[PDB]
Amino acid sequence: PVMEELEQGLLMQPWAWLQLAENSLLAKVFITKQGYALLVSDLQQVWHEQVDTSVVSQRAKELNKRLTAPPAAFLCHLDNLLRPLLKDAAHPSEATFSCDCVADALILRVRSELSGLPFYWNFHCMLASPSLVSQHLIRPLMGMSLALQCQVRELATLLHMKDLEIQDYQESGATLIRDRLKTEPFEENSFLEQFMIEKLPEACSIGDGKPFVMNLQDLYMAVTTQEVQVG
Amino acid sequence: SPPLCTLPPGPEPPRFVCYCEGEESGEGDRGGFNLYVTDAAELWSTCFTPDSLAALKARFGLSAAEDITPRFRAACEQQAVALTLQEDRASLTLSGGPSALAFDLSKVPGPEAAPRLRALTLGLAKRVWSLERRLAAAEETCPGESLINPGFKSKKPAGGVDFD
Amino acid sequence: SPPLCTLPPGPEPPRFVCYCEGEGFNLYVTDAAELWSTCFTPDSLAALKARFGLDITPRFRAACEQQAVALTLQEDRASLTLSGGPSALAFDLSKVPGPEAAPRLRALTLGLAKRVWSLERRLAAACPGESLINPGFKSKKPAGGVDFD
DSSP states (O other): OHHHHHHHHHHHSOOEEEEOSSOEEEEEEEEETTEEEEEEEOSSOEEEEEEEHHHHHHHHHHHSTTOOOOHHHHHHHHHHHHHHHHHOOSSOOOEEEEEEOOTTOEEEEEEEEETTEEEEEEEEEEEOOHHHHIIIIIHHHHHHHHHHHHHHHHHHHHHHHHHHHHHHHHHTTOOOSOSSSOOOOOOHHHHHHHHHHHTHHHHSOOTTSHHHHHHSHHHHHHHHHHHHHHO | OOOEEEESOSSSOOOEEEEEEOOOOSSSOOOOOEEEEEOSSOEEEOOOOHHHHHHHHHHTTOOTTOOSHHHHHHHHHHTOEEEEEOSSEEEEEEOSSSSOEEEEEEEOOHHHHHHHHHHHHHHHHHHHHHHHHHHHHHHTOOTTBOSSSTTSBOOOOOOOOOOO | OOOEEEESOSSSOOOEEEEOOOOOOOOEEEOSSOEEEOOOOHHHHHHHHHHHTOOHHHHHHHHHHHTOEEEEEETTEEEEEEOSSSSOEEEEEEEOOHHHHHHHHHHHHHHHHHHHHHHHHHHHTOOTTBOSSSTTSBOOOOOOOOOOO
């Protein structure tokens, strides 16, 4: 059951932007006293990891020897180190991050100072399975796109109603005072034609993934929650 | 000023008050997170335990080190709290965050609840006094065109002889 | 804005809280466990006003804002000294029965919670069947004769 709770928590969490020494990644981490689950990506490949208390203790002992800590304390310290970075960036961290892309696997090394002493950890993230990758990226993105299309349709209907009201005002023996405040009739086809050639090239640039985390996270979280509730 | 809220919402007279205690900041004494809810006649407390805290945090997709006080305060501000009272148990539903949270509460013993009620009353009086004083104190107490002469280009300052 | 005061109001946590209500108005002072009330009556209130040459509510509020209230407790008796006017006024109170007071503490707690919420919110923003042929006459169903059940 603990693994199931870890998976559900990882699914609930939103994407965050991580700036390594040279590159950038999109990461989602869920840490509990029983272990943790991590999912990283760079818009080309997705790596996933999930570890339990025993693995955490073994890795802590083998990496940073001379430290005798229970797995729960190590997990809590890892959460304290990671969560602030994911919530906000460009703030005092003092936690170096590095990545090594070994054959068909990734190693994410995190270094920090725990009360003025070294503290090292490594995430051994293997290639994520298609099922998990799909459930975490593809279906939520399609749901978000459909929701945004519905929002656009609703806004278009509202604009049509406002245009009808303006037409009624004009036809009711009216005379606009400020000619500058004159909105032209709204046409869906014309607006789409203008947009696709004026703003799509600059509005469809994902880049390194920063816009995705900065703009479409609330919708992503809502879609993921709805999918979880459905099934 | 620990987060708290009163129910039912609206202009009707209050009939229930809920608040949270614990998770004190700083290096001083720290107590486990707990919720106290009273009708002014009976008191309900979580009676949580560290295993209970871990189970509650993991159940709702919340990390062990995650702090629940900000979520409680945000929900109290939004008045997204719902209550269901049983014969001897209470269920509290919070919808202030992205995901709904469920809490279970049991009646506190009377001998132990009475000192808790007295402390709550004294604290409420102190907060009322402090906030009233604060409110009383605060509420009342063309490029290259000269700007000077439009239509004439701004002449550059006279430099003179500048040897190369 | 019912006036109230706490003792001590400084950094030390308050011990007793005093207030007034319903101007059978009686000054209520509570430690959150026990209560003391003046139990004023119209005749006694008139006699006290005549003796002191008299509303006390403005003076009580001024003292509470300025924290010019002095408390004394002795067994079941309580004594209050109020200052701010030309001459300080002294009042006496007896321990009201607990059974009669429990509703008083409940109401005080509910009112305090309501005031806290309200002040925090304030500081935050700072004819079917009518016959068509004959209007005014109800439509009448055609005579169905005898319809056996």
